[PDB]
Enzyme design. Structure first.
Site, PDB file in Angstrom:
ATOM      1  CG  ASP A   8      -1.726   1.020   1.479  1.00 40.80           C
ATOM      2  OD1 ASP A   8      -2.318   1.502   0.484  1.00 40.80           O
ATOM      3  OD2 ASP A   8      -1.909   1.354   2.671  1.00 40.80           O
ATOM      4  CG  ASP A  10      -1.439   7.851   0.734  1.00 44.34           C
ATOM      5  OD1 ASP A  10      -0.635   8.784   0.777  1.00 44.34           O
ATOM      6  OD2 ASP A  10      -2.142   7.621  -0.262  1.00 44.34           O
ATOM      7  CG  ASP A 133      -3.308   2.064   6.281  1.00 44.50           C
ATOM      8  OD1 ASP A 133      -3.350   1.666   5.119  1.00 44.50           O
ATOM      9  OD2 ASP A 133      -3.616   3.254   6.587  1.00 44.50           O
TER      10      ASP A 133
END
Ligand SMILES: [Mg+2]
Ligand SMILES: [Zn+2]
Length: 183
Positions: A8, A10, A133
């Site tokens: 991922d 960000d 996240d």
């Protein structure tokens, strides 16, 4: 054919300040460039797979993303991290920018980006990892048969649902090489 670490962006590579689209607001999270170089040294392909619905929202253009992504790619290559692929999804079904308004196969939780990367780079999905996240990252990974789903705590405080869909929870992508080695 080759094992990869899907990433991922960000919340995992850069601090998620909010629709990051400018070099001066792109901050690499502590220790991730070193961890990425080590992951390449171990033999893993590295592939960024990032949802960027900010484009569909009209918060920034695909051109600005391209500029920031080129900057990021160079900055990593220059520190000896050569990314094998960088995939991104600019769409959102409620997009204000018509060109990008649609459901698509690439918006995580859909596994599209991981599948394309798989076909393009010949990736051994079962020997690979997904690091992110959010729940959506872990759901795309399970749909794409990624062997180990790793959640990090460097972005969003995780939700119990993201935890439930993950195999491991690490403080940061910075800790992944050691975690893999202990295997
Ligand atoms: Mg994220
Ligand atoms: Zn898409």
């Amino acid at each position: 054919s080759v094992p990869a670490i899907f990433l991922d962006r960000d919340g995992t590579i850069n601090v998620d300040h909010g629709y990051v689209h400018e070099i001066d607001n792109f901050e690499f999270i502590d220790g991730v460039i070193d961890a990425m170089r080590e992951l390449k040294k171990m033999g893993f392909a590295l592939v960024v797979v990032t949802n960027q619905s900010g484009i569909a929202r009209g918060k920034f253009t695909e051109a600005q993303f391209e500029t920031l992504t080129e900057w990021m790619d160079w900055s990593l290559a220059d520190r000896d991290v050569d990314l094998d692929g960088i995939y991104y999804c600019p769409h959102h079904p409620q997009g204000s920018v018509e060109e990008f308004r649609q459901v698509c196969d690439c918006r995580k939780p859909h596994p599209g980006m991981l599948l394309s990367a798989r076909d393009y780079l010949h990736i051994d999905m079962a020997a690979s990892y997904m690091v992110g996240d959010k729940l959506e990252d872990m759901q795309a990974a399970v749909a794409a048969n990624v062997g180990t789903k790793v959640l990090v705590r460097t972005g969003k405080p995780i939700t119990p649902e993201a935890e439930n869909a993950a195999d491991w929870v690490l403080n940061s992508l910075a800790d992944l090489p050691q975690a893999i080695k202990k295997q």
